[PDB]
Amino acid sequence: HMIQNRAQAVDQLRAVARYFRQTEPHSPVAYLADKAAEWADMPLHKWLESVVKDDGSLSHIRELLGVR
Amino acid sequence: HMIQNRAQAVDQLRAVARYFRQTEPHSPVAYLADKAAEWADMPLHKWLESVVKDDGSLSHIRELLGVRP
Amino acid sequence: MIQNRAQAVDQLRAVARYFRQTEPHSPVAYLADKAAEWADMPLHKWLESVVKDDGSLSHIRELLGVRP
Amino acid sequence: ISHMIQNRAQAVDQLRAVARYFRQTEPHSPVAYLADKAAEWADMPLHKWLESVVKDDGSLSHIRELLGV
Amino acid sequence: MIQNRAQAVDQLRAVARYFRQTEPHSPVAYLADKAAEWADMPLHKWLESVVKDDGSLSHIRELLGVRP
Amino acid sequence: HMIQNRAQAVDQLRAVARYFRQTEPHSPVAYLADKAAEWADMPLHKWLESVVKDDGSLSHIRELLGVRP
Numbered sequence: 001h002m003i004q005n006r007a008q009a010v011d012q013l014r015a016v017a018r019y020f021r022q023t024e025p026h027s028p029v030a031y032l033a034d035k036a037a038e039w040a041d042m043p044l045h046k047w048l049e050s051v052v053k054d055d056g057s058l059s060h061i062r063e064l065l066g067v068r
Numbered sequence: 069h070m071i072q073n074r075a076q077a078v079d080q081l082r083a084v085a086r087y088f089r090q091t092e093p094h095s096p097v098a099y100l101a102d103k104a105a106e107w108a109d110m111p112l113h114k115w116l117e118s119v120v121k122d123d124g125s126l127s128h129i130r131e132l133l134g135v136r137p
Numbered sequence: 138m139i140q141n142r143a144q145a146v147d148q149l150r151a152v153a154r155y156f157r158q159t160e161p162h163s164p165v166a167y168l169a170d171k172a173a174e175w176a177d178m179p180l181h182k183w184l185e186s187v188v189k190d191d192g193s194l195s196h197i198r199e200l201l202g203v204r205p
Numbered sequence: 206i207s208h209m210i211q212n213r214a215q216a217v218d219q220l221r222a223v224a225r226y227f228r229q230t231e232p233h234s235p236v237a238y239l240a241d242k243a244a245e246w247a248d249m250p251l252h253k254w255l256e257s258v259v260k261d262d263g264s265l266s267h268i269r270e271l272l273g274v
Numbered sequence: 275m276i277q278n279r280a281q282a283v284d285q286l287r288a289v290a291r292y293f294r295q296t297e298p299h300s301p302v303a304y305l306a307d308k309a310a311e312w313a314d315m316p317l318h319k320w321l322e323s324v325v326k327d328d329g330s331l332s333h334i335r336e337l338l339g340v341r342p
Numbered sequence: 343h344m345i346q347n348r349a350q351a352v353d354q355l356r357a358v359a360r361y362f363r364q365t366e367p368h369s370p371v372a373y374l375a376d377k378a379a380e381w382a383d384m385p386l387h388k389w390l391e392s393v394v395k396d397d398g399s400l401s402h403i404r405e406l407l408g409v410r411p
Contacts, residue, residue: 001069003087012069012080013101019071025179026233028115028201029108033081035202036100047096112233119197122190129187132337133235134242139226148219149240155216159209162317163368164254164338165247169220171339172239183235206277209365251368258334261327268324272373273380276361284343285358286375292345301389305378306355309371320370 006040013037074108081105142176149173213247220244279313286310348382355379 003009013033020030039047045067052058062068071077081101088098107115113135120126127137139145149169156166175183181203188194198205224240231237246254252274259265276282290306297303312320318340325331335342345351355378362372381389387409394400404410 003083006092009084009087009097012084015069015071016077016080016104019077021179023074024231024233025177026112026183026231026235027108028119028180028233029077029081029104031180031201031203032100032104032107036084036097036104038202039100040095040097044094051096110232112235112238115233119200120188120193121196122193125188125190125193128189132187133238134245135238139222142230145223145226145236148223149236152216152219152223152243155212157316159213160366160368161313161315162251162320162366162370163247164258164317165217165220165243165368167317167338167340168239168243168246172223172236172243174339175239176234176236180233206361206365249367251370251373254368258337259325259330260333261330264326264330267326271324272370273377274373276357279362279365282358282361282371285354286371288343288345289351289354289358289378292351296348299386300382301393302351302355302378302382305374305381309358309374309378312374313369313371317368 010037010040013040078105078108081108146173146176149176217244217247220247283310283313286313352379352382355382 001008001012003012014037017030017033017037020027020033024030042050045062045065048058048061052061069080071080081104085098085101085105088095088101092098113130113133116126116129120129130137139148150173153166153169153173156163156169160166181198181201184194184197188197195205220240220243224237224244227234227237227240252269252272255265255268259268276285286306286309290303290310293300293303293306318335318338321331321334325334332342345354355375359372359375359379362369362375366372384392387404387407390400390403394403
């Protein structure tokens with residue numbers, strides 16, 4: 001099934017997760033496909049908030065982009 | 069798009085990465101879909117070596133499994 | 138020859154039963170049953186019971202997208 | 206008693222079989238590791254098993270005195 | 275010859291009784307009975323009454339999947 | 343089931359040890375059934391040497407019995 005848009009790619013990731021979740025309960029692949037699915041619709045600023053550890057490095061990037 | 073086996077699931081992850089490289093090159097999603105496809109082809113004891121930070125916790129795990137520390 | 142996950146679990150348990158009637162001292166039975174509980178235990182749960190270091194667990198959880 | 210020696214061989218071989226199943230179907234399953242370690246343990250005499258599992262040398266020596274080793 | 279584990283345990287008790295009736299100062303009577311107790315004692319119980327260090331014991335219980 | 347004398351009781355302990363040693367390599371019964379047979383053929387002063395830990399308590403017992411190394 002040729003992927004035509006972002007929401008289809010998300011559906012395909014979530015599906016891979018379902019395959020592994022019933023086929024291989026230990027595969028970390030499911031955990032990571034499901035994370036990738038959440039990331040797909042996460043706006044850059046939100047994504048940066050959760051991924052960047054240092055509050056200073058984060059403030060700097062918020063300044064380069066202009067957020068509050 | 070009904071996943072019949074392990075190969076297809078990996079094939080699809082890769083295809084998801086290919087979609088985001090062409091459509092959204094700033095998407096972190098391509099990186100994950102690929103890390104995930106590597107992880108599929110990596111056995112448990114190997115995956116744990118790259119993921120567990122503390123050496124003592126990693127020796128403990130190896131001991132529960134039987135691997136040679 | 139073993140066909141699915143459930144047969145493998147019955148075999149393990151059956152092996153454990155065998156060693157419990159014949160070698161009450163063999164650790165084989167204990168391990169056979171430990172393995173059968175692991176069979177259907179998902180990765181994130183298995184990691185909880187095996188990783189000693191709280192920090193290494195927080196990290197692994199973060200890589201996997203698991204929430205506390 | 207040779208029928209009892211062979212029944213353990215047969216049990217031990219089903220462990221190996223389980224581990225084989227899991228190694229080929231669920232490469233991330235820790236079950237493959239334990240099932241195989243269970244099979245090592247089956248052909249390991251008690252004092253060797255105690256040597257690898259009893260951490261503290263005091264408790265190990267005492268055990269050796271109880272058993273006479 | 276000895277055919278099964280109940281028959282072997284009987285010899286032990288039997289040996290204990292012969293030594294108790296013929297040589298009350300013999301320590302063999304005591305050890306034959308200890309052996310007979312041990313025969314019907316599961317590994318986890320046997321370890322419980324043999325291992326001295328709680329550290330060592332709790333570690334073994336973890337390896338075997340036993341709850342204290 | 344008819345034990346006639348000391349030597350038969352010792353052969354018997356030995357046979358018990360061989361039965362468990364051949365059938366249950368993890369049973370501690372063999373080790374112990376064999377120590378019993380060792381003890382059987384050991385005189386009291388030797389048995390007391392291997393079993394009494396404190397050298398003062400042992401010297402004293404040697405005095406009570408009139409033994410000399």
